[PDB]
Amino acid sequence: SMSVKKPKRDDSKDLALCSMILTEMETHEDAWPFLLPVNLKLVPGYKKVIKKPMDFSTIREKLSSGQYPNLETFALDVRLVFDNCETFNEDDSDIGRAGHNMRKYFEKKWTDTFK
């Protein structure tokens, strides 16, 4: 509360460390469905159904330009990528499986780096 603060957690490396995680996600062999924004002209249904499209390139641009106020808003966009994928793709598809694998990969890196 006013003039009463928990001890200051060192967040000075968070930007660098989120960048490294995002690099590792970018270079994963199953990243290919997630590298670029879904083409809303060429994928019937996507625009209407997926209210907040997100992809790795868009996260990378947001990260590089100071549009994440803290490491949690960064994790929310990463998870959004996989939530969108599960909304649109059957579990038993190449893209559906890719999304599950990537989410697992991300959540381990996240825990090991920050928890």
Swiss-Prot record:
Residues 9-113 form the Bromo domain. Signal peptide: none annotated. Belongs to the WAL family. It comes from Homo sapiens (Human). Component of the BRF-1 ISWI chromatin remodeling complex, at least composed of SMARCA1 and BAZ2B, which regulates the spacing of histone octamers on the DNA template to facilitate access to DNA. Within the BRF-1 ISWI chromatin remodeling complex interacts with SMARCA1; the interaction is direct. Component of the BRF-5 ISWI chromatin remodeling complex, at least composed of SMARCA5/SNF2H and BAZ2B, which regulates the spacing of histone octamers on the DNA template to facilitate access to DNA. Regulatory subunit of the ATP-dependent BRF-1 and BRF-5 ISWI chromatin remodeling complexes, which form ordered nucleosome arrays on chromatin and facilitate access to DNA during DNA-templated processes such as DNA replication, transcription, and repair. Both complexes regulate the spacing of nucleosomes along the chromatin and have the ability to slide mononucleosomes to the center of a DNA template. The BRF-1 ISWI chromatin remodeling complex has a lower ATP hydrolysis rate than the BRF-5 ISWI chromatin remodeling complex. It comes from the Eukaryota. Expressed at varying levels in several tissues, whereas a smaller transcript was expressed specifically in testis. It is found in: Nucleus. This is Bromodomain adjacent to zinc finger domain protein 2B.
